[PDB]
Amino acid sequence: PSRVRQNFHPDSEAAINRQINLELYASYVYLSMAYYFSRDDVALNNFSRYFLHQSREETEHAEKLMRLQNQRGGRIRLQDIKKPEQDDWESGLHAMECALLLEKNVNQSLLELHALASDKGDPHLCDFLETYYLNEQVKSIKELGDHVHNLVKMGAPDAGLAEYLFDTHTLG
Amino acid sequence: PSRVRQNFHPDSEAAINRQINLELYASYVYLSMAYYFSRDDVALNNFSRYFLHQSREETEHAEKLMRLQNQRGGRIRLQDIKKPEQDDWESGLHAMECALLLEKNVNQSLLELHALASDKGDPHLCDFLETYYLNEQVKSIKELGDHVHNLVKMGAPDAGLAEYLFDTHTLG
Amino acid sequence: PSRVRQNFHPDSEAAINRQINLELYASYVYLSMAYYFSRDDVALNNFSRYFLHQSREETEHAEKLMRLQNQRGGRIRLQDIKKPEQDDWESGLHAMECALLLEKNVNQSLLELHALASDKGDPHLCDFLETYYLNEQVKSIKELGDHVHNLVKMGAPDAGLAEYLFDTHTLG
Amino acid sequence: PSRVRQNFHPDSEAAINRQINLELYASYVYLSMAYYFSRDDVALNNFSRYFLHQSREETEHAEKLMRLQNQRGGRIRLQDIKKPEQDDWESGLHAMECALLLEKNVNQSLLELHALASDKGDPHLCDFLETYYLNEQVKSIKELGDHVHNLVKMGAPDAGLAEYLFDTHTLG
Ligand SMILES: [Cl-]
Ligand SMILES: [Cl-]
Ligand SMILES: [Cl-]
Ligand SMILES: [Cl-]
Ligand SMILES: [Cl-]
Ligand SMILES: [Cl-]
Ligand SMILES: [Cl-]
Ligand SMILES: [Cl-]
Ligand SMILES: [Cl-]
Ligand SMILES: [Cl-]
Ligand SMILES: [Cl-]
Ligand SMILES: [Cl-]
Ligand SMILES: [Cl-]
Ligand SMILES: [Cl-]
Ligand SMILES: [Cl-]
Ligand SMILES: [Cl-]
Ligand SMILES: [Cl-]
Ligand SMILES: [Cl-]
Ligand SMILES: [Cl-]
Ligand SMILES: [Cl-]
Ligand SMILES: [Cl-]
Ligand SMILES: [Cl-]
Ligand SMILES: [Cl-]
Ligand SMILES: [Cl-]
Ligand SMILES: [Mg+2]
Ligand SMILES: [Mg+2]
Ligand SMILES: [Mg+2]
Ligand SMILES: [Mg+2]
Ligand SMILES: [Mg+2]
Ligand SMILES: [Mg+2]
Ligand SMILES: [Mg+2]
Ligand SMILES: [Mg+2]
Ligand SMILES: [Mg+2]
Ligand SMILES: [Mg+2]
Ligand SMILES: [Mg+2]
Ligand SMILES: [Mg+2]
Ligand SMILES: [Mg+2]
Ligand SMILES: [Mg+2]
Ligand SMILES: [Mg+2]
Ligand SMILES: [Mg+2]
Ligand SMILES: [Mg+2]
Ligand SMILES: [Mg+2]
Ligand SMILES: [Mg+2]
Ligand SMILES: [Mg+2]
Ligand SMILES: [Mg+2]
Ligand SMILES: [Mg+2]
Ligand SMILES: [Mg+2]
Ligand SMILES: [Mg+2]
Ligand SMILES: [Mg+2]
Ligand SMILES: [Mg+2]
Ligand SMILES: [Mg+2]
Ligand SMILES: [Mg+2]
Ligand SMILES: [Mg+2]
Ligand SMILES: [Mg+2]
Ligand SMILES: [Mg+2]
Ligand SMILES: [Mg+2]
Ligand SMILES: [Mg+2]
Ligand SMILES: [Mg+2]
Ligand SMILES: [Mg+2]
Ligand SMILES: [Mg+2]
Ligand SMILES: [Mg+2]
Ligand SMILES: [Mg+2]
Ligand SMILES: [Mg+2]
Ligand SMILES: [Mg+2]
Ligand SMILES: [Mg+2]
Ligand SMILES: [Mg+2]
Ligand SMILES: [Mg+2]
Ligand SMILES: [Mg+2]
Ligand SMILES: [Mg+2]
Ligand SMILES: [Mg+2]
Numbered sequence: 249p250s251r252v253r254q255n256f257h258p259d260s261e262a263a264i265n266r267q268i269n270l271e272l273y274a275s276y277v278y279l280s281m282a283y284y285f286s287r288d289d290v291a292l293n294n295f296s297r298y299f300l301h302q303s304r305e306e307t308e309h310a311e312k313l314m315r316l317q318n319q320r321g322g323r324i325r326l327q328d329i330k331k332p333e334q335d336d337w338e339s340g341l342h343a344m345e346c347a348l349l350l351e352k353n354v355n356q357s358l359l360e361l362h363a364l365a366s367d368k369g370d371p372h373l374c375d376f377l378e379t380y381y382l383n384e385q386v387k388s389i390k391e392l393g394d395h396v397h398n399l400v401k402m403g404a405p406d407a408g409l410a411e412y413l414f415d416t417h418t419l420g
Numbered sequence: 421p422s423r424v425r426q427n428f429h430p431d432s433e434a435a436i437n438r439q440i441n442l443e444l445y446a447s448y449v450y451l452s453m454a455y456y457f458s459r460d461d462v463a464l465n466n467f468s469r470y471f472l473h474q475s476r477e478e479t480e481h482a483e484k485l486m487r488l489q490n491q492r493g494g495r496i497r498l499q500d501i502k503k504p505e506q507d508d509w510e511s512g513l514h515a516m517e518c519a520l521l522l523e524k525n526v527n528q529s530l531l532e533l534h535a536l537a538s539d540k541g542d543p544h545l546c547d548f549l550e551t552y553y554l555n556e557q558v559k560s561i562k563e564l565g566d567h568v569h570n571l572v573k574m575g576a577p578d579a580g581l582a583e584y585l586f587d588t589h590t591l592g
Numbered sequence: 593p594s595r596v597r598q599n600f601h602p603d604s605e606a607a608i609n610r611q612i613n614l615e616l617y618a619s620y621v622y623l624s625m626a627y628y629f630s631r632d633d634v635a636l637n638n639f640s641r642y643f644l645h646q647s648r649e650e651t652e653h654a655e656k657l658m659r660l661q662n663q664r665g666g667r668i669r670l671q672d673i674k675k676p677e678q679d680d681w682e683s684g685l686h687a688m689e690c691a692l693l694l695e696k697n698v699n700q701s702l703l704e705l706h707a708l709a710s711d712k713g714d715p716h717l718c719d720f721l722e723t724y725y726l727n728e729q730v731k732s733i734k735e736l737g738d739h740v741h742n743l744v745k746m747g748a749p750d751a752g753l754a755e756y757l758f759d760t761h762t763l764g
Numbered sequence: 765p766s767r768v769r770q771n772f773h774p775d776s777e778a779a780i781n782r783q784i785n786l787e788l789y790a791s792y793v794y795l796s797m798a799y800y801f802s803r804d805d806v807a808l809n810n811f812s813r814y815f816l817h818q819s820r821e822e823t824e825h826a827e828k829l830m831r832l833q834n835q836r837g838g839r840i841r842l843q844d845i846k847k848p849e850q851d852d853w854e855s856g857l858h859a860m861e862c863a864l865l866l867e868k869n870v871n872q873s874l875l876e877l878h879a880l881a882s883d884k885g886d887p888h889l890c891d892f893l894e895t896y897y898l899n900e901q902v903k904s905i906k907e908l909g910d911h912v913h914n915l916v917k918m919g920a921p922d923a924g925l926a927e928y929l930f931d932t933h934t935l936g
Contacts, residue, residue: 352598359599362715378719386716390663393596394463403580413581417588424632424909426868427875444620448673455658455668460596486627491906496627501620501673543878544902547894635910752919753929760933 250321257368261322263361264313270357271310272329277350278303280332281343292411294419295340302347312380320372339405340414341396348392355385422493429540433494435533436485442529443482444501449522450475452504453515464583466591467512474519484552492544511577512586513568520564527557594665601712605666607705608657614701615654616673621694622647624676625687636755638763639684646691656724664716683749684758685740692736699729766837773884777838779877780829786873787826788845793866794819796848797859808927810935811856818863828896836888855921856930857912864908871901 278299285296317324337343358381365373398418402410450471457468489496509515530553537545570590574582622643629640661668681687702725709717742762746754794815801812833840853859874897881889914934918926 348595355598359713359715363713366715374715378715382716382719386663389596389598390460390665393460393594393665396595397461397463398584401580402584407580409581413585417584422632422909423864423912424905426871426905444673448616448670451658452668452670455662458659458662459667460594460662460665486623487630490627490630490632491902493632493906493909495631495679496624497679498620498624498675500675501616503670503672507667507669541875541879543875543882543890543894544898547898632906632909633913635913752917752923753925756914756918756933757929 252319253321255370255372256320256322257370260361260365260368260370260373261317261320263364264317264322265325265327267357267361268310268313268317268324269327269329270354271306271313274350274354275303275306275310276329277332278306278347280335281337281347284335284337284343285340292340292415294415295343295411298419299343299347309381309384316373316376340411341399341404344392344395344399348389348396351385351388351392355382355389358382358385424491425493427542427544428492428494429542432533432537432540432542432545433489433492435536436489436494437497437499439529439533440482440485440489440496441499441501442526443478443485446522446526447475447478447482448501449504450478450519452507453509453519456507456509456515457512464512464587466587467515467583470591471515471519481553481556488545488548512583513571513576516564516567516571520561520568523557523560523564527554527561530554530557596663597665599714599716600664600666601714604705604709604712604714604717605661605664607708608661608666609669609671611701611705612654612657612661612668613671613673614698615650615657618694618698619647619650619654620673621676622650622691624679625681625691628679628681628687629684636684636759638759639687639755642763643687643691653725653728660717660720684755685743685748688736688739688743692733692740695729695732695736699726699733702726702729768835769837771886771888772836772838773886776877776881776884776886776889777833777836779880780833780838781841781843783873783877784826784829784833784840785843785845786870787822787829790866790870791819791822791826792845793848794822794863796851797853797863800851800853800859801856808856808931810931811859811927814935815859815863825897825900832889832892856927857915857920860908860911860915864905864912867901867904867908871898871905874898874901 282296282300282303284290285292285299314324334346337346358377362374362377362382365371365377395414395418399405399410399414402414404410404414454468454472454475456462457464457471486496506518509518530549534546534549534554537543537549567586567590571577571582571586574586576582576586626640626644626647628634629636629643658668678690681690702721706718706721706726709715709721739758739762743749743754743758746758748754748758798812798816798819800806801808801815830840850862853862874893878890878893878898881887881893911930911934915921915926915930918930920926920930
């Protein structure tokens with residue numbers, strides 16, 4: 249093994265590689281959403297900026313796991329980054345609801361990773377997830393829930409002023 | 421009696437202890453309201469901030485009466501702080517209407533305290549109430565009346581944009 | 593359930609509501625102590641300031657749990673805040689000893705909450721307690737133990753200079 | 765009458781002249797105390813400074829009443845300023861206890877003046893007393909009560925370190 253490797257189970261190494269792919273996938277989904285909102289027939293520039301920011305954060309989530317792999321003496325194994333489920337995200341509300349589902353799916357993956365690290369007696373990996381990932385996910389899910397609630401109450405997507413005003417106020 | 425006590429009737433001392441409890445109760449009601457508005461299914465962050473500010477002001481109202489008790493040589497007697505009437509405050513409009521009723525009830529208690537201080541020939545206590553409490557209550561009741569009127573006219577709670585826009589403009 | 597809720601057991605939600613009440617109770621105990629020390633027949637202004645500061649910290653402990661409840665999609669359920677065990681706290685030493693007992697009781701409640709979160713496989717809640725509560729309690733208990741030791745050694749409460757000098761030096 | 769005089773009863777004018785004399789008397793008592801504490805066989809320089817400050821405040825209390833008399837169209841009538849009851853004030857504790865008795869006697873005089881102004885339907889004079897005198901007296905009596913309590917508990921006047929340490933800490 250690597251002369252740095254210590255208390256680092258091969259199953260943990262493999263699960264970190266799968267999580268890297270999921271974070272890169274999330275970045276790509278948010279990039280897709282960002283450029284949907286800058287279409288001439290959508291033109292919600294603060295929705296665009298919001299999702300572009302989220303995309304860049306997901307790349308940093310991927311990089312911190314890649315750094316962890318190297319720190320612990322594992323070997324990064326990259327896989328294809330699947331295209332998102334849609335190019336046409338339909339509305340500001342629909343994109344927010346899809347983001348919320350994505351963030352809960354990423355959270356479930358992180359909770360499974362934490363359970364595996366716990367089973368393998370890897371407190372360093374548990375602390376890493378608890379310090380950089382699990383509260384970030386709770387905050388992200390709460391923010392998206394807030395946004396979905398306001399957009400639904402305002403009458404999105406069919407009420408003509410709702411997404412326009414949410415874009416200016418909340419995302420401005 | 422306390423070597424500081426002078427012209428301070430036991431009935432005034434007792435009424436000050438009851439007012440301390442009412443101010444602490446008002447703080448708790450406003451704390452409850454603040455955290456209702458930060459629920460994921462309410463998510464009106466400026467309503468939240470408004471009521472949190474009101475909560476902290478009520479604690480200062482309680483503390484100034486506690487200080488008065490000590491200044492005059494009375495003895496503070498604390499009682500349970502009752503839970504608010506609701507955890508679910510229903511809407512921005514309903515919370516504002518409940519706040520308005522609370523502030524008029526607190527005002528009536530202060531007016532009764534002033535009448536008692538007058539009956540007991542306690543001009544220091546009358547001046548204390550007139551300087552720190554009675555105009556504060558008039559201003560608070562007027563502000564809440566303004567807010568209720570605007571929210572009703574805008575169509576709250578059922579008009580989808582009303583509480584959202586009041587939160588951004590008036591409470592922003 | 594709330595569209596944000598994930599891996600959040602109803603027993604954890606209920607235990608968080610009980611902890612909120614205990615933090616609000618601790619705030620009230622420390623408020624009582626603060627205003628005992630500003631009585632004309634006690635007049636230890638730095639003891640007063642010390643306990644007032646502790647009171648305000650406990651309100652922030654309550655608020656962070658209220659925020660956690662909302663973040664995780666639980667529902668805050670407030671209860672009466674019981675009055676403290678005493679209005680007359682007897683001496684600087686006695687108040688410090690009562691504070692030490694309170695902080696150990698709050699610590700035991702937090703340790704039980706951590707054990708419950710562990711049993712329910714809630715690493716987010718475990719990390720929250722470990723990050724914001726458990727070391728805060730250890731530091732608070734140690735500080736109060738230091739203060740009790742010095743006051744006992746100095747001869748409090750009966751040695752006429754002891755609480756006066758502790759107030760000026762240690763709490764000044 | 766004076767072309768300014770309005771709603772100003774001769775009994776109020778006379779009571780203001782008596783209060784002017786009492787404030788000038790209080791200034792003289794505090795001047796006496798200040799210079800007792802700078803004797804070579806007393807030499808408590810912060811007790812001296814404390815009472816000198818109180819003396820100068822009493823002169824300002826006298827001047828504000830003299831200004832009120834002129835503002836309302838009354839005529840100032842000065843009388844002898846009686847010497848204080850003692851040149852030898854015995855101890856720091858005894859001077860503080862005598863100051864406390866003086867301030868309660870001045871407070872009783874002000875409360876009688878307020879009752880007279882009330883009987884004569886003079887709200888300007890009532891407000892003047894409530895704004896500049898009655899809370900000043902409550903604060904002064906409370907401070908002196910605090911000081912007396914600490915000096916008694918510390919063992920003054922017989923405990924050799926008590927007045928020395930109170931002078932350095934509390935009055936420093
Ligand atoms: Cl290994
Ligand atoms: Cl592949
Ligand atoms: Cl693949
Ligand atoms: Cl472990
Ligand atoms: Cl909703
Ligand atoms: Cl607008
Ligand atoms: Cl009395
Ligand atoms: Cl009770
Ligand atoms: Cl009760
Ligand atoms: Cl009166
Ligand atoms: Cl209306
Ligand atoms: Cl605007
Ligand atoms: Cl759940
Ligand atoms: Cl209850
Ligand atoms: Cl209860
Ligand atoms: Cl766990
Ligand atoms: Cl000890
Ligand atoms: Cl010292
Ligand atoms: Cl006249
Ligand atoms: Cl004369
Ligand atoms: Cl004379
Ligand atoms: Cl009048
Ligand atoms: Cl005493
Ligand atoms: Cl020192
Ligand atoms: Mg080697
Ligand atoms: Mg391998
Ligand atoms: Mg995958
Ligand atoms: Mg753009
Ligand atoms: Mg991520
Ligand atoms: Mg494919
Ligand atoms: Mg384990
Ligand atoms: Mg950790
Ligand atoms: Mg953290
Ligand atoms: Mg995020
Ligand atoms: Mg906003
Ligand atoms: Mg006495
Ligand atoms: Mg009594
Ligand atoms: Mg009541
Ligand atoms: Mg907020
Ligand atoms: Mg109030
Ligand atoms: Mg009940
Ligand atoms: Mg009257
Ligand atoms: Mg009046
Ligand atoms: Mg007044
Ligand atoms: Mg005013
Ligand atoms: Mg107010
Ligand atoms: Mg406006
Ligand atoms: Mg849904
Ligand atoms: Mg339930
Ligand atoms: Mg409890
Ligand atoms: Mg103080
Ligand atoms: Mg606490
Ligand atoms: Mg009870
Ligand atoms: Mg476990
Ligand atoms: Mg752990
Ligand atoms: Mg942790
Ligand atoms: Mg820490
Ligand atoms: Mg602490
Ligand atoms: Mg020290
Ligand atoms: Mg003329
Ligand atoms: Mg005349
Ligand atoms: Mg006289
Ligand atoms: Mg000097
Ligand atoms: Mg005076
Ligand atoms: Mg004579
Ligand atoms: Mg009248
Ligand atoms: Mg007035
Ligand atoms: Mg005033
Ligand atoms: Mg004074
Ligand atoms: Mg001091």
